[PDB]
Design a protein around this ligand. Sequence first.
Ligand code: CL
Ligand code: CL
Ligand code: CL
Ligand code: CL
Ligand code: CL
Ligand code: CL
Ligand code: CL
Ligand code: K
Ligand code: MG
Ligand code: MG
Ligand code: MG
Ligand code: MG
Ligand code: MG
Ligand code: MG
Ligand code: MG
Ligand code: MG
Ligand code: MG
Ligand code: MG
Ligand code: MG
Ligand code: MG
Ligand code: MG
Ligand code: MG
Ligand code: MG
Ligand code: MG
Ligand code: MG
Ligand code: MG
Ligand code: MG
Ligand code: MG
Ligand code: MG
Ligand code: MG
Ligand code: MG
Ligand code: NA
Ligand code: NA
Ligand code: NA
Ligand code: NA
Ligand code: NA
Ligand code: NA
Ligand code: NA
Ligand code: NA
Ligand code: NA
Ligand code: NA
Ligand code: NA
Ligand code: NA
Ligand code: NA
Ligand code: NA
Ligand code: NA
Ligand code: NA
Ligand code: NA
Ligand code: SR
Ligand code: SR
Ligand code: SR
Ligand code: SR
Ligand code: SR
Ligand code: SR
Ligand code: SR
Ligand code: SR
Ligand code: SR
Ligand code: SR
Ligand code: SR
Ligand code: SR
Ligand code: SR
Ligand code: SR
Ligand code: SR
Ligand code: SR
Ligand code: SR
Ligand code: SR
Ligand code: SR
Ligand code: SR
Ligand code: SR
Ligand code: SR
Ligand code: SR
Ligand code: SR
Ligand code: SR
Ligand code: SR
Lengths: 132, 172, 160, 142, 337
Amino acid sequence: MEALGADVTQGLEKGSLITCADNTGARELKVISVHGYSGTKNRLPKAGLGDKITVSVTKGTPEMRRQVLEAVVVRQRKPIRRPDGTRVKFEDNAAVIVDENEDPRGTELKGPIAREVAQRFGSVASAATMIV
Amino acid sequence: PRVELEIPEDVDAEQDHLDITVEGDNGSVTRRLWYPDIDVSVDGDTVVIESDEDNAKTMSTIGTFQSHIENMFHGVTEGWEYGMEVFYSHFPMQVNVEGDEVVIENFLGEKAPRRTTIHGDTDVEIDGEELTVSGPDIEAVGQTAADIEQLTRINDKDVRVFQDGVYITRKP
Amino acid sequence: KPASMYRDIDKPAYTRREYITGIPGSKIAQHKMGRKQKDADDYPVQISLIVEETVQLRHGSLEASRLSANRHLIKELGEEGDYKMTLRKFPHQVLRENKDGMRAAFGKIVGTAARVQAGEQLFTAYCNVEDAEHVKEAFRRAYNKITPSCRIDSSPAGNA
Amino acid sequence: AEFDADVIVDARDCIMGRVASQVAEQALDGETVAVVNAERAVITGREEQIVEKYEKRVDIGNDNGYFYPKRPDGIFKRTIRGMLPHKKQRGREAFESVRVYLGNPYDEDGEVLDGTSLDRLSNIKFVTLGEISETLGANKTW
Amino acid sequence: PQPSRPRKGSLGFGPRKRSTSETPRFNSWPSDDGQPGVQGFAGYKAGMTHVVLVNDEPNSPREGMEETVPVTVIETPPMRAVALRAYEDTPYGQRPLTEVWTDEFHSELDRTLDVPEDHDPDAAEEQIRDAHEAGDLGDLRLITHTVPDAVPSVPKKKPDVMETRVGGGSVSDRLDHALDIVEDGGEHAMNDIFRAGEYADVAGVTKGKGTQGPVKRWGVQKRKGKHARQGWRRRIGNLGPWNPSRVRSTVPQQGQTGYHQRTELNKRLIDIGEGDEPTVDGGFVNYGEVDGPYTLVKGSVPGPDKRLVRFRPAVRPNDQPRLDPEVRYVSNESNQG
RNA sequence: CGCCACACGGGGUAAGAGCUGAACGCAUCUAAGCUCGAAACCCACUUGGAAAAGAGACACCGCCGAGGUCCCGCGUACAAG
RNA sequence: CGAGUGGCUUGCUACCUCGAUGUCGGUUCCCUCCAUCCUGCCCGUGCAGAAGCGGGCAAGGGUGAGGUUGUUCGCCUAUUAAAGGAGGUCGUGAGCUGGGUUUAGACCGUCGUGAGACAGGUCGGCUGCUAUCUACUGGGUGUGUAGGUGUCUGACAAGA
RNA sequence: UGUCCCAACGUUGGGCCCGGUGAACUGUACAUUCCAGUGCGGAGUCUGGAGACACCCAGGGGGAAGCGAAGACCCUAUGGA
RNA sequence: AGCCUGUGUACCAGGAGGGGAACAACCCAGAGAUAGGUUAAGGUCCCCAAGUGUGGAUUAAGUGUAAUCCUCUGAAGGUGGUCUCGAGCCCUAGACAGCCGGGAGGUGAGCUUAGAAGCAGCUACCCUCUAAGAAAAGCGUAACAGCUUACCGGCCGAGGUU
Ligand SMILES: [Cl-]
Ligand SMILES: [Cl-]
Ligand SMILES: [Cl-]
Ligand SMILES: [Cl-]
Ligand SMILES: [Cl-]
Ligand SMILES: [Cl-]
Ligand SMILES: [Cl-]
Ligand SMILES: [K+]
Ligand SMILES: [Mg+2]
Ligand SMILES: [Mg+2]
Ligand SMILES: [Mg+2]
Ligand SMILES: [Mg+2]
Ligand SMILES: [Mg+2]
Ligand SMILES: [Mg+2]
Ligand SMILES: [Mg+2]
Ligand SMILES: [Mg+2]
Ligand SMILES: [Mg+2]
Ligand SMILES: [Mg+2]
Ligand SMILES: [Mg+2]
Ligand SMILES: [Mg+2]
Ligand SMILES: [Mg+2]
Ligand SMILES: [Mg+2]
Ligand SMILES: [Mg+2]
Ligand SMILES: [Mg+2]
Ligand SMILES: [Mg+2]
Ligand SMILES: [Mg+2]
Ligand SMILES: [Mg+2]
Ligand SMILES: [Mg+2]
Ligand SMILES: [Mg+2]
Ligand SMILES: [Mg+2]
Ligand SMILES: [Mg+2]
Ligand code: NA
Ligand code: NA
Ligand code: NA
Ligand code: NA
Ligand code: NA
Ligand code: NA
Ligand code: NA
Ligand code: NA
Ligand code: NA
Ligand code: NA
Ligand code: NA
Ligand code: NA
Ligand code: NA
Ligand code: NA
Ligand code: NA
Ligand code: NA
Ligand code: NA
Ligand SMILES: [Sr+2]
Ligand SMILES: [Sr+2]
Ligand SMILES: [Sr+2]
Ligand SMILES: [Sr+2]
Ligand SMILES: [Sr+2]
Ligand SMILES: [Sr+2]
Ligand SMILES: [Sr+2]
Ligand SMILES: [Sr+2]
Ligand SMILES: [Sr+2]
Ligand SMILES: [Sr+2]
Ligand SMILES: [Sr+2]
Ligand SMILES: [Sr+2]
Ligand SMILES: [Sr+2]
Ligand SMILES: [Sr+2]
Ligand SMILES: [Sr+2]
Ligand SMILES: [Sr+2]
Ligand SMILES: [Sr+2]
Ligand SMILES: [Sr+2]
Ligand SMILES: [Sr+2]
Ligand SMILES: [Sr+2]
Ligand SMILES: [Sr+2]
Ligand SMILES: [Sr+2]
Ligand SMILES: [Sr+2]
Ligand SMILES: [Sr+2]
Ligand SMILES: [Sr+2]
Ligand SMILES: [Sr+2]
């Protein structure tokens, strides 16, 4: 994919439960897979800021629950490093449900997003209120 | 068996060891004719290829040594020439000679230029959509022509649709 | 079952129907083919397929070869072509199989085969000097379905 | 570093195994032998199958080790060792009184041993120790 | 189903034993191109700090922007090219033929060598040039040593000696070039060889860690779950199958880890200067203060502070040179804290 | 869990694409010869390596003294050594 | 229908071992094979392209994470360039585990007059040893080459 | 929630070196082995090659079908309970 | 099956010594001690005693350098790889191949069909000019055209073909 523009220490793994930062009706998401990733023996697949991931809906509306969807990680608690050396970390781990074209399924994003993410998925960005 | 080849008056044939050199007004060509028990030599105004063996394998090479020698006679006088036409459908192909190699550009719209080095003292002349490869050494000349055509070989797609390339039009 | 199991003559002759029961029927549909109403002497050419090694040929193999040979002769000369071919051997040898370890191992009856000594004619065809090559092709296809190597020998035929 | 050889053999265009056999015979008889121009020694057959064999010897090995030589220098010296009981006193003595050289470090020229010569005009299927070494990856120091 | 998995550790850096010379020894040299010139230099590791640079990469989305970059400070005072050794080509590879020495020797070179009192530089030169006439001359190299004394943070005074090849134009020209340097007094500097922004290969003897087990030394797993409480925590499963009935040298075992020579490729030289601009407040931990010739290498360098590190023009650079990077800031903040 | 560094390019081939070419006047990529062509082979690069028994090379110093050991203060080293 | 190769399945034999060579599966760690799943290079196509499908060279590297089940196997899920198969005492208990199998306690179904039995099911149920030799990973002392210091060479060796 | 991803750093007692004390298991012999083969078909000792200068320290245990127990399984005995 | 179970015989068991790499029963050989000599099986380039023996031929695959065998594999099928032998027919009245030239008229045969003219199908398949030349063998065309085969002539010159 397009260079992120920052160094990321993946703070999530297959099975991690995270916040769904949008208004799709999904409240909590579970990580099932990470797009383009291939690990190594005994290694739990990891995902972090900027990665596109397959998710299953753990908490939310009946219609959304249990659905297997694609999403993009927009925030994480583990730090990331920007070109100038500073580390950046968020209050929580969150992702936004996205479709086959990477356009947000929802209509509004909740909470801040990382500039790095916004830049990779512009349509996701063109929905963000705050971009840190 | 023994075969004698009367050398042309335009030509001079000298040979030391297993190498033979032929010179004419069109240049010179040297070759190595080495095979078990086949002696090649210049006896006065004639070249001799002889052997005490006469089995299928020996006879085969004797016949081969001859054509090679007659081809050298021809090349040093009349010379050798292959004609080639450059054909392209959608993307204009730029064919040019640069240094000791012919360079082809925009083949099928490629950014990177395709190229091949010219063998021997072979000469390559292009005029419009026509190329003429010529020289005294049929080996070097023949290969150079072939290399140019090969240089536009495509394996990836259907050739019947994509035919762009430089093809040998006339074979000497 | 592989022919390696029965192609050799490594057992007594086992053919007595009076002491053997349950013998499977043969798969060979015909032994005399072509125009079997006409004599063999009525032909200028006589070509046989000769076996080069002594062996046993199971009926399933005689049928496959004969079939794959007459079939060709039919395809090249027609369902009524002026020719005639003969499979001169019949599968008299009964074969067993021990199908409990080596205890009371005598096998149950599973098939039949014909014993052919090297040099013998398995098949023999009679054709006109025209179809002489169509029969040589039928045999080529026949010896490809039986164990041993074979010689396609041309008996009456000095038209070459 | 100086080797008073009673005999100086010229391996140029000579069948390696045939020379090796005579050099071993002479070393056992007490002769100090120096084989010269090893890189030009010859071996008959398909270059392709000959090389496959020497490449296999190079690839063989394990912790204990199977150190096989790559230079015409050692290839030849090893060829001779396989014809000498190099683990016995008399055998090691013979082997150690034999040396092989790249080119010819002597002023005198070596002699060509009878029966070991190969006629290039009558043979095309043969390879040169030097050619084998280069294929094996040796540094063509000769 | 027994999933695949690469082996633990590389089999290309062994045997994993203690290095014979603490002074690194290059096993390769750059190719001959430009004018003749010494193909290497040396210095002593001091510590690290960071700098802020203006992006150089013309293919980078960030070209022309601030970028923080880690830097290892290496004190690189002048060295003395004390002699010229010539190698001749022989059937058994390259062998030293002779050397051309000088008269002016640093006051303490006698702490390592038996400095020459009676030498003849002309007979030697003669022999060398004769070898070139004959065409049996192999590469040309300079016997070089460092001047530890010029570095206060380093206790030693005994110079460290290494041979450095001289590459360049034609042999006749670089042979002359070599003799020039030597005869003077041999004194040369980091400038004479490298320019800020070029790529160098750095060689050094890594930090020693004495004996360490397979987990640390080879990166094998520790026993897991219940397997970690039975009496085995940091031991591998087995030393091999029933057959072959022997332990292969390829199985990860305990032993010496660290203090091995390593050659790190393509280290970008960020800046070559002199003074105390890179020095750190309070002093580099376990080293001292820098105030003199120095070199800022991008990233890390093998070895502990004070160890002798060697530079060489990169022999396999991946990228083109972008000389004299713009340094907008050099951290001097204390390294304690 | 952080940070840095980890080729391009040569050489010879396989399958394959061809050149010249005869046995077999022609034809033929093959029989002799040749041009190309794989992450594979060799080289490039890194690491070990004078116990390589052909047991190595060079320079200087020294044989009444060069160098070294013990001793002492210490670690860029270290289980003893 | 015919001819073979392997020794991965199963069967057969009873040649070795009953003064004992500790079962299956898993795990950990190492080497290998090719009948190639991916990756490189090719040929054909019912090859426009994109992509399929079939075939050739090729073992350098890779071939991963999860749900049921002791399972091997297999079924299933989301990823992936692909998530190949096989040998090493069905590699690996003087390395680990002890879930299955396979002692003594007990229950069920079936069988048996009964004691008791049943590759039928079920709950519980023990894992000894200070390494002599050899092998290998690292570290020393001597001898040999034959006064000392410093610098090298490079036969061979390892690498993905 | 360090069971795991994926391991790290630290604490105490050992381990290592020194003084003193001071056993046992085990031992047909020889024994520096490795790759193949052969052999009662599962060899450090046979055959062919390869490798191999001697001794010592620490180590984790691949092999000696390692040591420990005249196989508790299976069968046999004109055995026992 | 290095299996099971018979039979005859010699061997191992209980049999050395020589050979077979090693190897109970495959080969030589049955053996008191000691000594000289000659052979046996098997071998004679080196390891290792004896040939780098002679006349001749074949093989280019390192085939092979392996009597026997659990032990040494190699099959059905295929081969213009190469060597040797034989039979038929053609040929200096010029063969085989190649190259050059000619391949022509009635007449686009008749039928079928809107049309089909060598070449959809059906039937016939005849004669002029001539050194040859089909009522056309293979492509080709909507049908023609066009490209070749047969057939004749020339150049060339020695074996060719089955
Ligand atoms: Cl996954
Ligand atoms: Cl090895
Ligand atoms: Cl020996
Ligand atoms: Cl030859
Ligand atoms: Cl574990
Ligand atoms: Cl007797
Ligand atoms: Cl061979
Ligand atoms: K037992
Ligand atoms: Mg696992
Ligand atoms: Mg700090
Ligand atoms: Mg700080
Ligand atoms: Mg038994
Ligand atoms: Mg045991
Ligand atoms: Mg294959
Ligand atoms: Mg396609
Ligand atoms: Mg591999
Ligand atoms: Mg097992
Ligand atoms: Mg074990
Ligand atoms: Mg145990
Ligand atoms: Mg234990
Ligand atoms: Mg249970
Ligand atoms: Mg009870
Ligand atoms: Mg039971
Ligand atoms: Mg249970
Ligand atoms: Mg007992
Ligand atoms: Mg019992
Ligand atoms: Mg009783
Ligand atoms: Mg007995
Ligand atoms: Mg005698
Ligand atoms: Mg002898
Ligand atoms: Mg063979
Ligand atoms: Na040979
Ligand atoms: Na080797
Ligand atoms: Na324990
Ligand atoms: Na075991
Ligand atoms: Na290449
Ligand atoms: Na088989
Ligand atoms: Na591979
Ligand atoms: Na599963
Ligand atoms: Na076992
Ligand atoms: Na196991
Ligand atoms: Na256990
Ligand atoms: Na186990
Ligand atoms: Na812990
Ligand atoms: Na052990
Ligand atoms: Na007897
Ligand atoms: Na013997
Ligand atoms: Na062979
Ligand atoms: Sr039988
Ligand atoms: Sr057959
Ligand atoms: Sr001799
Ligand atoms: Sr396994
Ligand atoms: Sr150095
Ligand atoms: Sr080196
Ligand atoms: Sr335990
Ligand atoms: Sr073993
Ligand atoms: Sr080819
Ligand atoms: Sr030495
Ligand atoms: Sr036992
Ligand atoms: Sr293969
Ligand atoms: Sr592929
Ligand atoms: Sr199993
Ligand atoms: Sr199952
Ligand atoms: Sr079960
Ligand atoms: Sr049960
Ligand atoms: Sr249990
Ligand atoms: Sr000695
Ligand atoms: Sr031995
Ligand atoms: Sr221990
Ligand atoms: Sr001879
Ligand atoms: Sr002969
Ligand atoms: Sr066996
Ligand atoms: Sr056999
Ligand atoms: Sr065959």
